[PDB]
Enzyme design. Structure first.
Site, PDB file in Angstrom:
ATOM      1  N   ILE A  56      61.999  -3.783  58.460  1.00 24.49           N
ATOM      2  CA  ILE A  56      61.036  -4.587  59.026  1.00 24.49           C
ATOM      3  C   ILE A  56      61.407  -6.292  58.973  1.00 24.49           C
ATOM      4  O   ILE A  56      61.169  -6.767  60.028  1.00 24.49           O
ATOM      5  CB  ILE A  56      59.651  -4.451  58.322  1.00 24.49           C
ATOM      6  N   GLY A  57      62.331  -6.485  58.109  1.00 23.93           N
ATOM      7  CA  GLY A  57      63.136  -7.717  58.086  1.00 23.93           C
ATOM      8  C   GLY A  57      64.609  -7.797  57.769  1.00 23.93           C
ATOM      9  O   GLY A  57      65.050  -6.734  57.295  1.00 23.93           O
ATOM     10  N   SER A  58      65.019  -8.983  58.084  1.00 25.36           N
ATOM     11  CA  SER A  58      66.630  -9.271  57.970  1.00 25.36           C
ATOM     12  C   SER A  58      66.972 -10.436  57.444  1.00 25.36           C
ATOM     13  O   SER A  58      65.832 -11.631  57.513  1.00 25.36           O
ATOM     14  CB  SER A  58      67.160  -8.689  59.296  1.00 25.36           C
ATOM     15  N   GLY A  59      68.280 -11.000  57.379  1.00 27.93           N
ATOM     16  CA  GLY A  59      68.494 -12.340  57.137  1.00 27.93           C
ATOM     17  C   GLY A  59      68.832 -12.570  55.330  1.00 27.93           C
ATOM     18  O   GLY A  59      69.336 -11.719  54.676  1.00 27.93           O
ATOM     19  N   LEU A 108      67.272  -7.948  52.960  1.00 29.52           N
ATOM     20  CA  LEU A 108      66.396  -6.961  53.876  1.00 29.52           C
ATOM     21  C   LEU A 108      65.158  -6.688  53.548  1.00 29.52           C
ATOM     22  O   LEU A 108      64.886  -6.327  52.166  1.00 29.52           O
ATOM     23  CB  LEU A 108      67.523  -5.667  54.405  1.00 29.52           C
ATOM     24  N   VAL A 109      64.376  -6.391  54.254  1.00 31.63           N
ATOM     25  CA  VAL A 109      62.887  -5.782  53.935  1.00 31.63           C
ATOM     26  C   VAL A 109      62.388  -4.803  54.697  1.00 31.63           C
ATOM     27  O   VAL A 109      62.944  -4.610  56.135  1.00 31.63           O
ATOM     28  CB  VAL A 109      62.006  -7.062  54.250  1.00 31.63           C
ATOM     29  N   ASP A 139      60.238 -23.332  47.433  1.00 35.21           N
ATOM     30  CA  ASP A 139      60.525 -23.081  49.007  1.00 35.21           C
ATOM     31  C   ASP A 139      59.063 -22.786  49.566  1.00 35.21           C
ATOM     32  O   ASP A 139      59.057 -21.569  50.323  1.00 35.21           O
ATOM     33  CB  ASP A 139      61.737 -22.288  49.376  1.00 35.21           C
TER      34      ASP A 139
HETATM   35  C1  0F2 Z   1      55.481  -3.548  59.701  1.00 36.58           C
HETATM   36  C2  0F2 Z   1      54.284  -4.522  59.935  1.00 36.58           C
HETATM   37  C3  0F2 Z   1      54.771  -5.997  60.325  1.00 36.58           C
HETATM   38  O1  0F2 Z   1      55.787  -6.018  61.196  1.00 36.58           O
HETATM   39  C4  0F2 Z   1      53.713  -6.868  60.471  1.00 36.58           C
HETATM   40  C5  0F2 Z   1      53.065  -6.497  61.765  1.00 36.58           C
HETATM   41  C6  0F2 Z   1      55.369  -6.561  58.926  1.00 36.58           C
HETATM   42  C7  0F2 Z   1      56.611  -7.030  58.942  1.00 36.58           C
HETATM   43  C8  0F2 Z   1      57.156  -7.553  57.608  1.00 36.58           C
HETATM   44  O2  0F2 Z   1      58.415  -8.276  57.580  1.00 36.58           O
HETATM   45  C9  0F2 Z   1      58.415  -9.545  58.493  1.00 36.58           C
HETATM   46  C10 0F2 Z   1      59.784  -9.930  58.665  1.00 36.58           C
HETATM   47  N1  0F2 Z   1      60.193 -10.915  57.640  1.00 36.58           N
HETATM   48  C11 0F2 Z   1      61.235 -11.705  58.029  1.00 36.58           C
HETATM   49  C12 0F2 Z   1      61.641 -12.733  56.923  1.00 36.58           C
HETATM   50  O3  0F2 Z   1      61.565 -12.396  55.400  1.00 36.58           O
HETATM   51  C13 0F2 Z   1      60.351 -11.529  55.329  1.00 36.58           C
HETATM   52  C14 0F2 Z   1      59.958 -10.630  56.214  1.00 36.58           C
HETATM   53  C15 0F2 Z   1      56.591  -7.373  56.310  1.00 36.58           C
HETATM   54  C16 0F2 Z   1      56.667  -7.810  55.132  1.00 36.58           C
HETATM   55  C17 0F2 Z   1      55.775  -7.405  54.282  1.00 36.58           C
HETATM   56  C18 0F2 Z   1      55.819  -7.415  53.108  1.00 36.58           C
HETATM   57  N2  0F2 Z   1      54.763  -7.137  52.148  1.00 36.58           N
HETATM   58  N3  0F2 Z   1      54.725  -7.528  51.001  1.00 36.58           N
HETATM   59  C19 0F2 Z   1      56.095  -8.057  50.889  1.00 36.58           C
HETATM   60  C20 0F2 Z   1      56.892  -8.953  49.938  1.00 36.58           C
HETATM   61  C21 0F2 Z   1      58.022  -9.761  50.531  1.00 36.58           C
HETATM   62  S1  0F2 Z   1      57.807  -9.160  52.258  1.00 36.58           S
HETATM   63  C22 0F2 Z   1      56.532  -8.210  52.396  1.00 36.58           C
HETATM   64  N4  0F2 Z   1      54.924  -6.672  55.055  1.00 36.58           N
HETATM   65  C23 0F2 Z   1      55.152  -6.816  56.416  1.00 36.58           C
HETATM   66  C24 0F2 Z   1      54.864  -6.381  57.608  1.00 36.58           C
END
Ligand code: 0F2
Length: 241
Positions: free
Chosen positions: A15-18, A21-22, A125
């Site tokens: 779901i995340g990068s940079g 990774l998430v 931050d």
């Molecule tokens: C899959 C559903 C959805 O695309 C929203 C529509 C989503 C996307 C997520 O990641 C977004 C990407 N960012 C990029 C920057 O660094 C943080 C993550 C995240 C990240 C989380 C999340 N939930 N709990 C935590 C703790 C640290 S990150 C995170 N929930 C997410 C949900």
């Protein structure tokens, strides 16, 4: 402590990068979890950050299920936030937000920041990218254990305090009311001269009273800036009136 075996975790989608990774996943094939995996280039400080976060309990702060330390790269097991980071959520749902909803988001961040201020924990931050959206548009502050969000003491002398986070909250407030806009868009070295001269423009959705609080956060002296405890009741008074 809270050690989790890598076999207990199931990886579903990146779901995340940079940063690192998430990943969206499951813990014990039951709970929806957000797995934050470390990037190659510190392991000790990464585990230390989670231990601090696990000792701070507030409804407006992200919670952790545990930590995976057995196999490298190591990862932190967080609670899954349905609507992702605040910065992305504001841009995708732009033009659909009401002024009352945007102030409610700022009040949620202020609630968590008032708890951290009292516990003497400094969020170095604080930004919309470091805030998460959950069920019923609830905002939770993440990573509590970038010159655009930095105060004059930070970008020149590296003096961190709860009042420097107030400045970051002021820039966070701007990101919310402008609906996910990038502040000072303009290099980090160029942004220093603009701040030192004596700021960000008033967003369309933000009122005179809302922008007044933003400038109180944007004061040159840290002592002139109001504390998060004072800011919370100040932002609540605008919601009533
Ligand atoms: C899959 C559903 C959805 O695309 C929203 C529509 C989503 C996307 C997520 O990641 C977004 C990407 N960012 C990029 C920057 O660094 C943080 C993550 C995240 C990240 C989380 C999340 N939930 N709990 C935590 C703790 C640290 S990150 C995170 N929930 C997410 C949900």
């Amino acid at each position: 402590g809270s050690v989790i075996d890598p076999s207990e975790l199931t990886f579903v989608q990146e779901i995340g990068s940079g940063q690192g990774l998430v990943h969206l996943g499951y813990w014990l094939n039951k709970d929806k979890v957000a797995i934050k995996t470390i990037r190659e280039g510190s392991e000790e400080d990464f585990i230390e950050e989670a231990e601090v976060m696990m000792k701070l309990s507030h409804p407006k702060l992200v919670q952790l299920y545990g930590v995976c330390l057995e196999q490298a790269p190591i990862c932190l097991v967080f609670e899954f936030m349905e609507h992702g980071c605040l910065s992305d959520y504001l841009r995708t749902q732009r033009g659909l937000f009401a002024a009352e909803t945007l102030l409610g988001m700022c009040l949620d961040v202020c609630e968590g920041m008032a708890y951290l201020e009292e516990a003497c924990v400094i969020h170095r931050d604080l930004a919309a990218r470091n805030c998460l959206v959950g069920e019923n548009q609830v905002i939770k502050v993440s990573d509590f254990g970038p010159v655009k969000w930095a105060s004059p003491e930070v970008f020149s002398f590296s003096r961190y305090s709860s009042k420097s986070d107030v400045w970051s909250f002021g820039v966070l407030m701007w990101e919310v009311f402008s609906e996910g806009k990038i502040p000072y868009e303009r290099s980090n070295s160029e942004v220093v001269e603009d701040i030192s001269t004596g700021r960000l423009y008033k967003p369309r959705l933000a009122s005179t009273h809302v922008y007044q609080i933003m400038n109180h956060c944007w004061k040159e002296r840290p002592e002139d800036r109001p504390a998060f405890s004072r800011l919370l009741r100040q932002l609540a008074e605008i919601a009533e009136s």
